[PDB]
Protein backbone atom coordinates (compact mmCIF):
# COMPACT_ATOMS: atom_id res chain seq x y z
CA UNK A 1 0.00 0.00 0.00
CA UNK A 2 2.97 2.31 -0.58
CA UNK A 3 1.25 4.14 -3.44
CA UNK A 4 -1.56 4.94 -1.01
CA UNK A 5 0.81 6.61 1.45
CA UNK A 6 2.84 8.54 -1.13
CA UNK A 7 -0.33 9.77 -2.84
CA UNK A 8 -1.66 10.83 0.57
CA UNK A 9 1.50 12.83 1.30
CA UNK A 10 1.46 14.29 -2.23
CA UNK A 11 -2.17 15.41 -1.86
CA UNK A 12 -1.10 16.96 1.46
CA UNK A 13 1.67 18.94 -0.19
CA UNK A 14 -0.30 20.08 -3.26
CA UNK A 15 -3.44 21.15 -1.36
CA UNK A 16 -1.32 23.69 0.58
CA UNK B 1 44.79 15.93 -19.39
CA UNK B 2 44.91 19.73 -19.63
CA UNK B 3 48.01 20.13 -21.76
CA UNK B 4 48.86 23.33 -23.61
CA UNK B 5 47.83 21.48 -26.78
CA UNK B 6 44.44 20.71 -25.22
CA UNK B 7 43.65 24.12 -23.77
CA UNK B 8 44.72 26.25 -26.74
CA UNK B 9 42.57 23.99 -28.92
CA UNK B 10 39.72 24.65 -26.50
CA UNK B 11 40.40 28.40 -26.75
CA UNK B 12 40.48 28.53 -30.55
CA UNK B 13 37.37 26.36 -30.71
CA UNK B 14 35.60 28.62 -28.24
CA UNK B 15 36.31 32.03 -29.71
CA UNK B 16 35.09 30.88 -33.14
CA UNK B 17 31.77 30.19 -31.43
CA UNK B 18 32.00 33.59 -29.75
CA UNK B 19 32.51 35.52 -32.99
CA UNK B 20 29.77 33.50 -34.71
CA UNK B 21 27.44 34.41 -31.84
CA UNK B 22 28.41 38.03 -32.43
CA UNK B 23 27.72 37.53 -36.14
CA UNK B 24 24.18 36.23 -35.51
CA UNK B 25 23.42 38.91 -32.93
CA UNK B 26 24.77 41.40 -35.56
CA UNK B 27 22.55 40.09 -38.27
CA UNK B 28 19.35 39.93 -36.21
CA UNK B 29 19.75 43.56 -35.12
CA UNK B 30 20.54 44.49 -38.74
CA UNK B 31 17.37 42.74 -39.83
CA UNK B 32 14.70 43.53 -37.20
CA UNK B 33 15.76 46.27 -34.78
CA UNK B 34 17.46 48.38 -37.45
CA UNK B 35 15.60 50.08 -40.29
CA UNK B 36 14.74 40.83 -43.26
CA UNK B 37 16.44 37.47 -42.71
CA UNK B 38 14.62 34.32 -41.61
CA UNK B 39 15.74 31.68 -39.10
CA UNK B 40 17.00 29.04 -41.59
CA UNK B 41 18.81 31.76 -43.53
CA UNK B 42 20.60 32.76 -40.33
CA UNK B 43 21.53 29.18 -39.51
CA UNK B 44 23.42 28.04 -42.60
CA UNK B 45 25.09 31.45 -42.85
CA UNK B 46 26.35 31.02 -39.28
CA UNK B 47 27.64 27.53 -40.03
CA UNK B 48 29.29 28.76 -43.26
CA UNK B 49 30.93 31.47 -41.19
CA UNK B 50 32.15 28.99 -38.57
CA UNK B 51 33.69 26.66 -41.15
CA UNK B 52 35.24 29.53 -43.11
CA UNK B 53 36.85 30.57 -39.82
CA UNK B 54 37.91 27.01 -38.96
CA UNK B 55 39.73 26.61 -42.28
CA UNK B 56 42.31 29.29 -41.46
CA UNK B 57 43.72 27.79 -38.26
CA UNK B 58 44.16 24.01 -38.70
CA UNK B 59 42.36 16.42 -38.41
CA UNK B 60 38.92 15.81 -36.89
CA UNK B 61 37.48 19.32 -36.62
CA UNK B 62 34.15 20.99 -37.24
CA UNK B 63 30.72 21.85 -35.84
CA UNK B 64 29.61 19.94 -32.77
CA UNK B 65 26.17 21.55 -32.50
CA UNK B 66 24.47 22.99 -35.61
CA UNK B 67 23.16 26.43 -34.75
CA UNK B 68 19.77 26.05 -33.08
CA UNK B 69 17.32 28.97 -32.77
CA UNK B 70 14.46 28.13 -30.41
CA UNK B 71 11.52 30.53 -30.12
CA UNK B 72 9.22 30.93 -27.15
CA UNK B 73 8.20 27.31 -26.49
CA UNK B 74 10.89 24.98 -27.84
CA UNK B 75 13.43 23.61 -25.37
CA UNK B 76 15.63 22.35 -28.20
CA UNK B 77 15.84 20.96 -31.70
CA UNK B 78 14.56 23.74 -33.94
CA UNK B 79 17.09 24.28 -36.72
CA UNK B 80 15.39 23.79 -40.10
CA UNK B 81 16.62 23.87 -43.68
CA UNK B 82 15.64 25.96 -46.71
CA UNK B 83 13.95 22.82 -48.16
CA UNK B 84 11.29 22.93 -45.49
CA UNK B 85 9.99 26.51 -45.62
CA UNK B 86 6.97 25.89 -47.88
CA UNK B 87 6.42 22.52 -46.20
CA UNK B 88 6.09 24.24 -42.81
CA UNK B 89 3.47 26.61 -44.24
CA UNK B 90 1.33 24.01 -46.01
CA UNK B 91 1.51 21.74 -42.96
CA UNK B 92 0.66 24.41 -40.38
CA UNK B 93 -1.71 26.24 -42.75
CA UNK B 94 -4.81 25.30 -40.76
CA UNK B 95 -3.35 25.78 -37.28
CA UNK B 96 -3.59 28.91 -35.12
CA UNK B 97 -1.37 31.94 -34.55
CA UNK B 98 0.99 30.34 -32.01
CA UNK B 99 4.33 29.13 -33.40
CA UNK B 100 3.93 31.68 -36.21
CA UNK B 101 7.52 32.84 -35.66
CA UNK B 102 9.04 29.38 -36.02
CA UNK B 103 6.65 28.51 -38.86
CA UNK B 104 7.30 31.56 -41.05
CA UNK B 105 10.90 32.40 -40.12
CA UNK B 106 10.13 36.07 -39.50
CA UNK B 107 10.50 36.87 -35.80
CA UNK B 108 7.93 38.93 -33.90
CA UNK B 109 8.27 41.45 -31.07
CA UNK B 110 8.53 40.06 -27.56
CA UNK B 111 9.89 36.84 -29.03
CA UNK B 112 12.31 34.98 -26.79
CA UNK B 113 15.05 33.73 -29.12
CA UNK B 114 17.37 31.10 -27.64
CA UNK B 115 20.43 30.74 -29.87
CA UNK B 116 22.89 27.91 -29.30
CA UNK B 117 25.87 26.45 -31.13
CA UNK B 118 29.23 24.78 -30.62
CA UNK B 119 32.54 23.98 -32.28
CA UNK B 120 35.04 21.17 -31.80
CA UNK B 121 38.67 20.46 -32.67
CA UNK B 122 40.11 16.93 -32.34
CA UNK B 123 37.22 16.03 -30.02
CA UNK B 124 37.82 19.02 -27.74
CA UNK B 125 34.58 20.96 -27.95
CA UNK B 126 32.96 24.16 -26.73
CA UNK B 127 29.21 24.83 -26.61
CA UNK B 128 27.52 28.17 -26.02
CA UNK B 129 24.07 29.68 -26.04
CA UNK B 130 22.22 32.86 -25.24
CA UNK B 131 18.60 33.76 -24.71
CA UNK B 132 18.06 37.14 -26.38
CA UNK B 133 14.74 38.94 -26.80
CA UNK B 134 13.05 41.11 -29.46
CA UNK B 135 11.44 44.38 -28.38
CA UNK B 136 10.07 47.07 -30.73
CA UNK B 137 11.91 50.18 -31.84
CA UNK B 138 12.09 53.82 -30.87
CA UNK B 139 11.38 56.10 -33.82
CA UNK B 140 11.34 59.59 -32.28
CA UNK B 141 14.68 58.91 -30.56
CA UNK B 142 17.79 59.77 -32.61
CA UNK B 143 19.88 56.72 -31.67
CA UNK B 144 16.81 54.42 -31.52
CA UNK B 145 17.63 52.15 -28.68
CA UNK B 146 14.52 49.97 -29.05
CA UNK B 147 11.59 50.84 -26.84
CA UNK B 148 10.27 49.16 -23.73
CA UNK B 149 11.81 46.62 -21.37
CA UNK B 150 10.42 43.13 -20.96
CA UNK B 151 7.89 42.47 -18.21
CA UNK B 152 6.07 39.21 -17.50
CA UNK B 153 7.29 35.65 -17.07
CA UNK B 154 9.81 35.68 -19.91
CA UNK B 155 11.65 38.39 -17.97
CA UNK B 156 11.69 36.03 -14.94
CA UNK B 157 13.11 33.36 -17.17
CA UNK B 158 15.94 35.51 -18.55
CA UNK B 159 16.78 36.74 -15.04
CA UNK B 160 16.93 33.22 -13.60
CA UNK B 161 19.07 32.11 -16.55
CA UNK B 162 21.68 34.85 -16.12
CA UNK B 163 21.80 34.65 -12.33
CA UNK B 164 22.08 30.85 -12.29
CA UNK B 165 24.82 31.12 -14.93
CA UNK B 166 26.95 33.55 -12.93
CA UNK B 167 26.40 31.71 -9.64
CA UNK B 168 27.45 28.32 -11.02
CA UNK B 169 30.44 29.97 -12.72
CA UNK B 170 31.51 31.34 -9.35
CA UNK B 171 30.92 28.00 -7.60
CA UNK B 172 33.08 26.12 -10.08
CA UNK B 173 35.68 28.88 -9.62
CA UNK B 174 35.76 28.29 -5.87
CA UNK B 175 36.23 24.59 -6.71
CA UNK B 176 39.92 25.49 -7.10
CA UNK B 177 40.20 26.99 -3.60
CA UNK B 178 38.95 25.08 -0.51
CA UNK B 179 38.21 28.55 0.91
CA UNK B 180 36.60 31.74 -0.40
CA UNK B 181 33.23 29.97 -0.10
CA UNK B 182 30.51 30.95 2.40
CA UNK B 183 29.89 27.79 4.42
CA UNK B 184 26.17 28.58 4.07
CA UNK B 185 33.83 20.98 -0.38
CA UNK B 186 31.67 21.35 -3.50
CA UNK B 187 28.96 18.93 -4.61
CA UNK B 188 26.04 18.43 -6.94
CA UNK B 189 23.96 18.68 -3.77
CA UNK B 190 25.10 22.29 -3.35
CA UNK B 191 24.74 23.02 -7.07
CA UNK B 192 21.19 21.66 -7.32
CA UNK B 193 20.31 23.42 -4.06
CA UNK B 194 21.37 26.89 -5.17
CA UNK B 195 19.94 26.61 -8.68
CA UNK B 196 16.64 25.19 -7.40
CA UNK B 197 16.22 27.98 -4.86
CA UNK B 198 17.01 30.54 -7.57
CA UNK B 199 14.35 28.92 -9.78
CA UNK B 200 11.88 28.95 -6.88
CA UNK B 201 12.64 32.60 -6.10
CA UNK B 202 11.96 33.63 -9.70
CA UNK B 203 8.98 31.24 -10.11
CA UNK B 204 10.58 29.56 -13.14
CA UNK B 205 11.06 25.81 -13.02
CA UNK B 206 14.04 23.86 -14.30
CA UNK B 207 13.59 21.98 -17.58
CA UNK B 208 14.34 18.19 -17.65
CA UNK B 209 16.99 18.53 -20.35
CA UNK B 210 19.18 21.00 -18.45
CA UNK B 211 22.41 19.81 -16.86
CA UNK B 212 25.91 20.63 -15.65
CA UNK B 213 28.55 18.02 -16.38
CA UNK B 214 32.13 17.00 -17.04
CA UNK B 215 33.63 16.83 -20.54
CA UNK B 216 36.29 14.63 -22.10
CA UNK B 217 37.63 14.30 -25.64
CA UNK B 218 34.80 13.47 -28.09
CA UNK B 219 32.46 13.06 -25.05
CA UNK B 220 30.71 16.34 -24.29
CA UNK B 221 27.00 15.61 -23.99
CA UNK B 222 26.06 16.98 -27.42
CA UNK B 223 23.36 14.30 -27.66
CA UNK B 224 22.58 13.49 -24.00
CA UNK B 225 19.37 11.61 -24.90
CA UNK B 226 20.35 9.05 -27.55
CA UNK B 227 23.84 7.71 -26.85
CA UNK B 228 24.73 6.17 -23.49
CA UNK B 229 27.80 6.21 -21.25
CA UNK B 230 28.88 4.58 -17.97
CA UNK B 231 31.30 7.28 -16.78
CA UNK B 232 29.16 10.41 -16.49
CA UNK B 233 29.59 12.69 -13.47
CA UNK B 234 27.29 15.69 -13.45
CA UNK B 235 23.92 16.97 -12.34
CA UNK B 236 20.49 16.96 -14.01
CA UNK B 237 17.03 18.17 -12.95
CA UNK B 238 14.28 15.92 -14.32
CA UNK B 239 10.79 14.85 -13.26
CA UNK B 240 12.21 12.37 -10.74
CA UNK B 241 13.92 15.24 -8.93
CA UNK B 242 10.74 17.32 -9.22
CA UNK B 243 8.69 14.65 -7.43
CA UNK B 244 11.45 14.08 -4.87
CA UNK B 245 11.53 17.80 -4.04
CA UNK B 246 7.75 17.79 -3.73
CA UNK B 247 8.05 14.81 -1.36
CA UNK B 248 10.77 16.25 0.90
CA UNK B 249 22.28 6.59 -13.27
CA UNK B 250 23.82 10.04 -12.63
CA UNK B 251 24.78 9.85 -8.94
CA UNK B 252 25.07 13.24 -7.22
CA UNK B 253 26.60 12.28 -3.86
CA UNK B 254 29.99 10.80 -4.86
CA UNK B 255 30.76 13.91 -6.89
CA UNK B 256 33.15 16.67 -5.85
CA UNK B 257 34.66 18.82 -8.53
CA UNK B 258 38.44 18.92 -8.92
CA UNK B 259 41.26 20.87 -10.54
CA UNK B 260 42.30 20.42 -14.15
CA UNK B 261 38.91 19.67 -15.67
CA UNK B 262 36.51 20.98 -18.31
CA UNK B 263 32.79 21.43 -17.61
CA UNK B 264 29.61 22.26 -19.51
CA UNK B 265 26.80 24.36 -18.03
CA UNK B 266 23.39 24.26 -19.75
CA UNK B 267 20.46 25.83 -17.88
CA UNK B 268 16.84 25.99 -19.08
CA UNK B 269 14.16 27.87 -17.12
CA UNK B 270 10.43 27.65 -17.92
CA UNK B 271 8.39 30.53 -16.55
CA UNK B 272 5.19 30.35 -14.49
CA UNK B 273 3.12 33.54 -14.32
CA UNK B 274 -0.07 31.53 -14.95
CA UNK B 275 -0.77 27.86 -14.42
CA UNK B 276 -2.37 28.71 -11.13
CA UNK B 277 -1.13 25.61 -9.35
CA UNK B 278 1.58 23.06 -8.68
CA UNK B 279 2.40 21.01 -11.74
CA UNK B 280 4.96 19.10 -13.76
CA UNK B 281 7.25 20.48 -16.50
CA UNK B 282 7.93 17.83 -19.19
CA UNK B 283 8.80 17.65 -22.89
CA UNK B 284 6.76 16.66 -25.93
CA UNK B 285 8.15 15.75 -29.33
CA UNK B 286 7.18 17.42 -32.60
CA UNK B 287 6.38 15.14 -35.54
CA UNK B 288 5.70 15.84 -39.22
CA UNK B 289 2.30 14.09 -39.03
CA UNK B 290 -0.75 16.29 -39.47
CA UNK B 291 -3.41 13.63 -39.03
CA UNK B 292 -2.56 12.27 -35.60
CA UNK B 293 -4.78 14.95 -34.03
CA UNK B 294 -7.16 17.82 -34.80
CA UNK B 295 -6.03 20.45 -32.29
CA UNK B 296 -4.50 23.68 -33.58
CA UNK B 297 -1.99 24.28 -30.79
CA UNK B 298 0.20 21.47 -32.12
CA UNK B 299 3.30 22.26 -34.16
CA UNK B 300 4.07 20.20 -37.26
CA UNK B 301 7.69 20.07 -38.40
CA UNK B 302 10.64 17.90 -39.40
CA UNK B 303 13.96 17.96 -37.50
CA UNK B 304 17.06 18.77 -39.51
CA UNK B 305 19.82 17.37 -37.32
CA UNK B 306 20.74 13.67 -37.35
CA UNK B 307 23.32 11.46 -35.62
CA UNK B 308 24.70 8.06 -36.65
CA UNK B 309 25.21 5.29 -34.30
CA UNK B 310 28.46 4.00 -35.75
CA UNK B 311 27.92 0.63 -34.02
CA UNK B 312 25.47 -0.57 -36.70
CA UNK B 313 26.07 -1.37 -40.36
CA UNK B 314 23.86 -2.23 -43.33
CA UNK B 315 24.61 -2.19 -47.07
CA UNK B 316 22.22 0.13 -48.89
CA UNK B 317 20.75 -0.67 -52.30
CA UNK B 318 20.93 3.01 -53.30
CA UNK B 319 23.96 4.75 -54.81
CA UNK B 320 22.96 8.18 -53.49
CA UNK B 321 22.47 6.75 -50.00
CA UNK B 322 25.86 5.03 -49.99
CA UNK B 323 27.61 8.20 -51.17
CA UNK B 324 25.81 10.21 -48.49
CA UNK B 325 26.91 7.66 -45.90
CA UNK B 326 30.49 8.14 -47.09
CA UNK B 327 30.05 11.88 -46.65
CA UNK B 328 28.58 11.26 -43.18
CA UNK B 329 31.15 8.89 -41.72
CA UNK B 330 33.96 11.06 -43.08
CA UNK B 331 32.46 13.60 -40.71
CA UNK B 332 32.46 12.81 -37.00
CA UNK B 333 30.19 11.58 -34.21
CA UNK B 334 28.58 14.99 -33.72
CA UNK B 335 25.16 15.90 -35.16
CA UNK B 336 24.93 17.27 -38.68
CA UNK B 337 22.61 18.65 -41.33
CA UNK B 338 22.35 17.68 -44.97
CA UNK B 339 23.49 21.17 -45.94
CA UNK B 340 26.79 20.69 -44.07
CA UNK B 341 27.51 17.73 -46.36
CA UNK B 342 27.77 19.36 -49.77
CA UNK B 343 30.05 20.91 -52.38
CA UNK B 344 29.25 24.64 -52.15
CA UNK B 345 28.11 24.95 -48.54
CA UNK B 346 30.72 27.31 -46.97
CA UNK B 347 29.79 29.91 -49.65
CA UNK B 348 33.20 31.42 -50.47
CA UNK B 349 31.21 33.94 -52.46
CA UNK B 350 27.45 33.92 -51.89
CA UNK B 351 24.71 34.34 -54.49
CA UNK B 352 21.40 32.74 -55.44
CA UNK B 353 22.92 30.21 -57.84
CA UNK B 354 24.97 28.60 -55.07
CA UNK B 355 21.91 28.38 -52.83
CA UNK B 356 20.16 26.73 -55.79
CA UNK B 357 23.08 24.28 -56.14
CA UNK B 358 22.68 23.47 -52.46
CA UNK B 359 18.93 22.98 -52.84
CA UNK B 360 19.38 20.45 -55.65
CA UNK B 361 21.98 18.58 -53.58
CA UNK B 362 19.45 18.62 -50.72
CA UNK B 363 16.77 17.14 -52.96
CA UNK B 364 19.12 14.21 -53.58
CA UNK B 365 20.23 13.97 -49.94
CA UNK B 366 16.67 13.56 -48.71
CA UNK B 367 16.26 10.52 -50.95
CA UNK B 368 19.51 9.10 -49.58
CA UNK B 369 18.46 9.84 -46.00
CA UNK B 370 15.15 8.05 -46.57
CA UNK B 371 16.86 4.68 -46.94
CA UNK B 372 19.58 5.56 -44.43
CA UNK B 373 16.80 6.18 -41.88
CA UNK B 374 14.48 3.28 -42.79
CA UNK B 375 17.40 1.15 -41.76
CA UNK B 376 18.42 2.16 -38.25
CA UNK B 377 21.75 3.80 -39.17
CA UNK B 378 20.89 7.47 -38.51
CA UNK B 379 18.25 8.92 -36.21
CA UNK B 380 16.72 12.33 -35.65
CA UNK B 381 17.64 14.63 -32.78
CA UNK B 382 14.09 15.43 -31.64
CA UNK B 383 12.32 18.77 -31.46
CA UNK B 384 11.07 19.14 -27.87
CA UNK B 385 8.51 21.64 -26.57
CA UNK B 386 8.07 22.32 -22.86
CA UNK B 387 4.58 21.41 -21.68
CA UNK B 388 2.90 21.77 -18.29
CA UNK B 389 0.73 19.18 -16.52
CA UNK B 390 -1.05 19.74 -13.17
CA UNK B 391 -0.65 17.09 -10.48
CA UNK B 392 -4.45 16.70 -10.28
CA UNK B 393 -4.75 14.73 -13.53
CA UNK B 394 -1.72 12.60 -12.65
CA UNK B 395 -2.99 11.68 -9.18
CA UNK B 396 -6.52 11.02 -10.46
CA UNK B 397 -5.05 8.98 -13.33
CA UNK B 398 -5.34 5.23 -13.87
CA UNK B 399 -2.27 3.28 -15.02
CA UNK B 400 -3.20 -0.44 -15.07
CA UNK B 401 0.48 -1.47 -15.28
CA UNK B 402 3.26 0.64 -13.76
CA UNK B 403 7.01 0.20 -14.27
CA UNK B 404 6.20 -2.24 -17.11
CA UNK B 405 4.83 0.10 -19.80
CA UNK B 406 7.34 0.50 -22.60
CA UNK B 407 6.32 2.50 -25.56
CA UNK B 408 7.15 -0.17 -28.17
CA UNK B 409 7.42 1.69 -31.49
CA UNK B 410 9.55 4.32 -30.08
CA UNK B 411 12.58 4.07 -32.22
CA UNK B 412 15.46 5.12 -29.94
CA UNK B 413 14.86 2.99 -26.89
CA UNK B 414 16.50 5.35 -24.43
CA UNK B 415 13.58 7.82 -24.38
CA UNK B 416 11.41 4.68 -24.21
CA UNK B 417 12.79 2.89 -21.14
CA UNK B 418 12.89 6.10 -19.11
CA UNK B 419 10.53 5.85 -16.11
CA UNK B 420 10.76 9.60 -15.34
CA UNK B 421 8.94 9.40 -11.98
CA UNK B 422 9.41 5.87 -10.48
CA UNK B 423 7.20 6.84 -7.55
CA UNK B 424 3.56 6.72 -8.74
CA UNK B 425 4.72 4.12 -11.27
CA UNK B 426 3.86 6.22 -14.38
CA UNK B 427 6.03 6.14 -17.52
CA UNK B 428 6.61 8.54 -20.39
CA UNK B 429 3.89 6.90 -22.50
CA UNK B 430 1.13 7.35 -19.92
CA UNK B 431 2.51 10.80 -19.09
CA UNK B 432 2.13 11.75 -22.76
CA UNK B 433 -1.41 10.35 -22.63
CA UNK B 434 -2.23 12.49 -19.59
CA UNK B 435 -0.57 15.59 -21.06
CA UNK B 436 -2.79 15.20 -24.13
CA UNK B 437 -5.87 14.04 -22.06
CA UNK B 438 -6.71 17.58 -20.74
CA UNK B 439 -7.86 21.00 -21.89
CA UNK B 440 -5.13 22.40 -19.60
CA UNK B 441 -2.66 21.96 -22.47
CA UNK B 442 -0.51 24.82 -21.16
CA UNK B 443 2.82 25.18 -22.95
CA UNK B 444 5.45 27.23 -21.15
CA UNK B 445 8.01 29.72 -22.51
CA UNK B 446 11.63 28.80 -21.84
CA UNK B 447 14.94 30.65 -21.59
CA UNK B 448 18.32 29.02 -22.19
CA UNK B 449 21.93 29.76 -21.25
CA UNK B 450 24.84 27.44 -22.10
CA UNK B 451 28.57 27.91 -21.32
CA UNK B 452 31.84 25.99 -21.26
CA UNK B 453 34.46 26.44 -18.54
CA UNK B 454 37.75 24.87 -17.48
CA UNK B 455 39.51 24.72 -14.11
CA UNK B 456 43.32 24.92 -14.17
CA UNK B 457 44.84 29.24 -10.43
CA UNK B 458 41.80 30.66 -12.23
CA UNK B 459 38.53 29.69 -13.89
CA UNK B 460 39.05 29.97 -17.65
CA UNK B 461 35.58 30.54 -19.10
CA UNK B 462 35.86 29.53 -22.75
CA UNK B 463 32.46 31.04 -23.66
CA UNK B 464 30.12 33.71 -22.33
CA UNK B 465 31.56 37.06 -21.36
CA UNK B 466 29.96 40.47 -21.55
CA UNK B 467 30.49 40.97 -25.29
CA UNK B 468 28.59 37.69 -25.97
CA UNK B 469 25.68 37.33 -23.68
CA UNK B 470 25.07 40.73 -22.15
CA UNK B 471 21.36 40.57 -21.21
CA UNK B 472 18.64 42.56 -22.93
CA UNK B 473 17.72 44.97 -20.07
CA UNK B 474 14.32 43.95 -18.71
CA UNK B 475 11.89 44.67 -15.87
CA UNK B 476 11.15 41.57 -13.81
CA UNK B 477 9.82 40.99 -10.31
CA UNK B 478 10.26 38.32 -7.63
CA UNK B 479 13.86 39.57 -7.62
CA UNK B 480 15.61 37.24 -5.21
CA UNK B 481 14.07 36.77 -1.73
CA UNK B 482 16.71 37.80 0.96
CA UNK B 483 16.67 36.29 4.50
CA UNK B 484 18.05 32.87 3.77
CA UNK B 485 21.30 30.93 4.14
CA UNK B 486 21.73 30.24 0.52
CA UNK B 487 20.90 33.77 -0.63
CA UNK B 488 23.54 35.19 1.72
CA UNK B 489 25.97 32.68 0.24
CA UNK B 490 25.05 33.64 -3.33
CA UNK B 491 25.47 37.37 -2.72
CA UNK B 492 28.78 36.79 -0.93
CA UNK B 493 29.80 34.70 -3.95
CA UNK B 494 28.92 37.48 -6.38
CA UNK B 495 30.89 40.03 -4.35
CA UNK B 496 33.86 37.69 -3.88
CA UNK B 497 34.11 36.88 -7.60
CA UNK B 498 35.21 40.49 -8.21
CA UNK B 499 38.65 39.98 -6.61
CA UNK B 500 38.34 34.85 -7.41
CA UNK B 501 39.91 35.09 -10.87
CA UNK B 502 37.72 34.42 -13.91
CA UNK B 503 39.59 34.61 -17.21
CA UNK B 504 37.37 34.96 -20.28
CA UNK B 505 38.24 34.37 -23.94
CA UNK B 506 37.33 37.19 -26.31
CA UNK B 507 35.83 36.80 -29.80
CA UNK B 508 37.80 37.04 -33.03
CA UNK B 509 37.44 40.11 -35.24
Amino acid sequence: SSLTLVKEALWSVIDD
Amino acid sequence: ILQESVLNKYRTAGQIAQTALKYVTSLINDSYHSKQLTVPELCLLTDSFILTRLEQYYNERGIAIPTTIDIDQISGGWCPEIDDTQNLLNWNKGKDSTFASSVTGTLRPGDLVKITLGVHIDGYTSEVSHTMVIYPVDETKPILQPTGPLLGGKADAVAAAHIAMETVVALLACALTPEKLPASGITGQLIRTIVDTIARSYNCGVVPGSRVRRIRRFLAGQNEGIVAEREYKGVVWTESHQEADLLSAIPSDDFVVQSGEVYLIDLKMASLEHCTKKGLVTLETVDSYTGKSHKAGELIARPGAYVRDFAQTHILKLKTSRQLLTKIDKQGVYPFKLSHLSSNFPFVHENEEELQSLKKDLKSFRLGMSEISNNYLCVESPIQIARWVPWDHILKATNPNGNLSYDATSTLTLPGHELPLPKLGVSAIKLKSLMNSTKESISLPVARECNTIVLCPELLRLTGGSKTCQPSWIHSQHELNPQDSIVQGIFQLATLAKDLLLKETQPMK
Binding site: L3 | K396, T398, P400, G402, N403, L404, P422, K423, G425
Partner: protein, 125 residues
Protein backbone atom coordinates in the same frame (compact mmCIF):
# COMPACT_ATOMS: atom_id res chain seq x y z
CA UNK C 1 -49.58 -8.29 -11.45
CA UNK C 2 -49.25 -8.17 -15.23
CA UNK C 3 -52.44 -6.99 -16.96
CA UNK C 4 -51.31 -6.34 -20.55
CA UNK C 5 -50.57 -8.40 -23.66
CA UNK C 6 -47.70 -6.18 -25.02
CA UNK C 7 -45.45 -7.11 -22.14
CA UNK C 8 -43.98 -10.48 -21.16
CA UNK C 9 -43.00 -12.16 -17.89
CA UNK C 10 -40.44 -14.28 -19.76
CA UNK C 11 -37.06 -14.66 -18.06
CA UNK C 12 -35.38 -15.45 -21.37
CA UNK C 13 -36.78 -12.47 -23.29
CA UNK C 14 -36.03 -10.10 -20.41
CA UNK C 15 -32.44 -11.28 -19.95
CA UNK C 16 -31.86 -11.09 -23.71
CA UNK C 17 -33.22 -7.53 -23.80
CA UNK C 18 -30.95 -6.53 -20.91
CA UNK C 19 -27.76 -8.08 -22.28
CA UNK C 20 -28.37 -6.81 -25.84
CA UNK C 21 -29.65 -3.41 -24.76
CA UNK C 22 -28.11 -0.57 -26.81
CA UNK C 23 -26.45 2.40 -25.16
CA UNK C 24 -29.50 4.68 -25.40
CA UNK C 25 -31.44 2.24 -23.20
CA UNK C 26 -28.45 1.42 -21.01
CA UNK C 27 -28.40 5.12 -20.12
CA UNK C 28 -31.82 4.88 -18.47
CA UNK C 29 -31.04 1.42 -17.06
CA UNK C 30 -27.90 2.71 -15.31
CA UNK C 31 -29.83 5.11 -13.08
CA UNK C 32 -28.80 6.25 -9.62
CA UNK C 33 -30.94 7.49 -6.71
CA UNK C 34 -30.31 10.89 -5.18
CA UNK C 35 -29.40 11.76 -1.62
CA UNK C 36 -32.04 13.09 0.75
CA UNK C 37 -30.71 16.64 0.46
CA UNK C 38 -30.96 16.69 -3.33
CA UNK C 39 -34.33 14.95 -3.10
CA UNK C 40 -35.69 17.73 -0.88
CA UNK C 41 -33.98 20.30 -3.13
CA UNK C 42 -35.55 19.17 -6.40
CA UNK C 43 -38.49 16.84 -5.71
CA UNK C 44 -37.24 13.79 -7.59
CA UNK C 45 -36.13 10.33 -6.49
CA UNK C 46 -33.74 9.16 -9.23
CA UNK C 47 -31.98 10.16 -12.44
CA UNK C 48 -29.79 8.66 -15.15
CA UNK C 49 -26.12 8.95 -14.23
CA UNK C 50 -23.57 10.87 -16.30
CA UNK C 51 -19.91 11.78 -16.24
CA UNK C 52 -19.29 14.93 -14.18
CA UNK C 53 -21.62 13.96 -11.32
CA UNK C 54 -20.27 13.74 -7.79
CA UNK C 55 -21.32 10.50 -6.16
CA UNK C 56 -21.11 8.51 -2.93
CA UNK C 57 -21.00 4.75 -2.31
CA UNK C 58 -23.36 3.02 0.13
CA UNK C 59 -22.89 -0.70 -0.65
CA UNK C 60 -19.89 -2.97 -1.02
CA UNK C 61 -16.46 -2.99 0.55
CA UNK C 62 -15.77 0.52 -0.81
CA UNK C 63 -18.57 1.99 1.28
CA UNK C 64 -18.51 5.50 2.69
CA UNK C 65 -16.20 6.65 -0.11
CA UNK C 66 -17.14 9.38 -2.55
CA UNK C 67 -15.85 11.16 -5.61
CA UNK C 68 -16.71 12.31 -9.09
CA UNK C 69 -17.35 9.88 -11.91
CA UNK C 70 -14.48 9.42 -14.35
CA UNK C 71 -16.16 7.12 -16.87
CA UNK C 72 -19.49 5.48 -17.66
CA UNK C 73 -18.68 2.09 -19.19
CA UNK C 74 -22.08 1.21 -20.59
CA UNK C 75 -20.55 -1.82 -22.31
CA UNK C 76 -19.54 -3.25 -18.92
CA UNK C 77 -22.74 -1.99 -17.23
CA UNK C 78 -20.74 0.07 -14.77
CA UNK C 79 -19.16 3.41 -13.91
CA UNK C 80 -15.56 4.27 -13.00
CA UNK C 81 -15.13 6.72 -10.12
CA UNK C 82 -11.85 8.31 -9.07
CA UNK C 83 -10.36 7.71 -5.59
CA UNK C 84 -11.68 4.12 -5.71
CA UNK C 85 -8.87 1.98 -7.10
CA UNK C 86 -7.14 -1.34 -6.51
CA UNK C 87 -3.53 -0.22 -6.13
CA UNK C 88 -0.89 -2.81 -6.97
CA UNK C 89 2.52 -2.77 -5.32
CA UNK C 90 4.34 -1.63 -8.47
CA UNK C 91 2.31 1.58 -8.72
CA UNK C 92 -0.56 0.49 -10.97
CA UNK C 93 -4.12 1.61 -10.22
CA UNK C 94 -7.18 0.07 -11.87
CA UNK C 95 -10.68 1.50 -11.28
CA UNK C 96 -13.26 -0.49 -9.36
CA UNK C 97 -16.29 -1.12 -11.58
CA UNK C 98 -19.38 0.04 -9.70
CA UNK C 99 -23.10 -0.17 -10.40
CA UNK C 100 -25.06 3.11 -9.99
CA UNK C 101 -28.05 1.43 -8.32
CA UNK C 102 -25.78 1.17 -5.28
CA UNK C 103 -24.35 4.68 -5.61
CA UNK C 104 -26.18 7.77 -4.39
CA UNK C 105 -25.72 11.19 -5.99
CA UNK C 106 -24.65 14.15 -3.84
CA UNK C 107 -24.09 16.84 -6.49
CA UNK C 108 -25.11 17.08 -10.14
CA UNK C 109 -23.67 18.49 -13.37
CA UNK C 110 -26.41 20.79 -14.65
CA UNK C 111 -27.02 21.94 -18.21
CA UNK C 112 -30.17 22.83 -20.14
CA UNK C 113 -31.25 19.28 -21.04
CA UNK C 114 -30.75 18.09 -17.45
CA UNK C 115 -32.73 21.04 -16.07
CA UNK C 116 -35.47 20.23 -18.56
CA UNK C 117 -35.44 16.57 -17.51
CA UNK C 118 -35.93 17.61 -13.90
CA UNK C 119 -38.72 20.09 -14.72
CA UNK C 120 -40.36 17.34 -16.79
CA UNK C 121 -40.11 14.70 -14.07
CA UNK C 122 -41.65 17.20 -11.65
CA UNK C 123 -38.83 19.15 -10.05
CA UNK C 124 -39.23 22.57 -8.49
CA UNK C 125 -35.53 23.29 -9.14
Amino acid sequence: AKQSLDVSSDRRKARKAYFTAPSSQRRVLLSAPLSKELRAQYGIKALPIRRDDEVLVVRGSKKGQEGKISSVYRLKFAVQVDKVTKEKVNGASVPINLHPSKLVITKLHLDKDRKALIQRKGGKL
